[PDB]
Design a protein around this ligand. Structure first.
Ligand SMILES: N[C@@H](Cc1ccccc1)C(=O)O
Ligand SMILES: [Co+2]
Length: 275
């Protein structure tokens, strides 16, 4: 049997723009159970993350006043975020079209899935805990925020050249699953890792995954999988290094990559700096 997925179930009776796919955050749809689920996830992660999350992330939670005991009011958070870096979050029903996503980032709007996972499934699909808790705190960092805006603006060129998957790989291996080295050890900045109960341990503690120095061409030539822990994590030295490394013209890189065989998710390339 085919049954409606969680995105369809959660958005019953609600609407989305056919242009920018936003809706006002439906505060009335959050149950007591949702706020409790948020509180449980928030508590779990805030216990686990010290000494694992990069310090900028944990500071962002505090400076944005991300609620510990309820699903945050997006408008209230936006007061703090707009003052910091001129960004705002917008509510979306779930996954949105790539062009809309890029257009949002290009305009300093970060799309956040409004609804929350059920306590039964504390998942695959992005929810508000992943999108808000995982992605938003680093937007208070001006270099990271500029990186996301630049990434957004880059969507037009990528789409024109049939290279959106190459940009998607870059996003995945930085914004979603990135690690950052520090003198105190490796830390986490990827939004896919920070909300997780188990990958946050594995990515720093396990001998299994490869930890490879960031390399733009390598990353855009590297496949990924969505339903398993990462076999490779890419490591930056700073958000500045990441912004600068991604500032050159990607057009000739895309054309060269278009004609190449990509690395598998678990491969170590000949030129990898393995850490
Ligand atoms: N430099 C890229 C744009 C981009 C910036 C930052 C991240 C990703 C892409 C281009 O020429 O299109
Ligand atoms: Co994400």
């Amino acid at each position: 049997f085919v049954v409606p997925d969680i995105t369809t179930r959660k958005n019953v009776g609600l609407s989305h723009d056919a242009n920018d796919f936003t809706l006002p955050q439906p505060l009335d749809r959050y149950s007591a159970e949702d706020h409790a689920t948020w509180a449980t996830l928030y508590q779990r992660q805030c216990k686990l993350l010290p000494g694992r999350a990069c310090d900028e992330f944990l500071e962002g939670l505090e400076r944005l006043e991300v609620d510990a005991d309820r699903v945050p009011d997006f408008n209230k958070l936006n007061e703090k975020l707009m003052a910091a870096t001129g960004w705002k979050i917008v509510a979306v029903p779930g996954l949105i079209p790539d062009d809309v996503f890029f257009e949002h980032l290009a305009n300093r709007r970060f799309p956040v899935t409004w609804w929350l996972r059920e306590p039964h499934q504390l998942l695959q699909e992005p929810d508000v805990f992943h999108d808000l808790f995982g992605h938003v705190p680093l937007l208070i960092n001006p270099v990271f925020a500029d990186y996301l805006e630049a990434y957004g603006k880059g969507g037009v060129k990528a789409k024109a050249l049939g290279a959106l998957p190459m940009l998607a790989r870059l996003y995945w291996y930085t914004v979603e699953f990135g690690l950052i080295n520090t003198p105190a050890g490796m830390r986490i900045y990827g939004a896919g890792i920070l909300p997780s109960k188990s990958e946050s341990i594995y990515c720093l503690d396990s001998a299994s995954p490869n930890r490879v120095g960031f390399d733009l061409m390598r990353i855009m030539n590297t496949r990924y999988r969505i339903d398993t822990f990462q076999k490779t994590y890419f490591v930056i030295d700073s958000f500045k290094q990441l912004f600068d490394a991604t500032a050159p013209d990607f057009a000739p890189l895309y054309l060269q990559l278009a004609d190449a065989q990509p690395w598998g998710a678990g491969d170590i390339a000949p030129d990898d700096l393995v850490l």
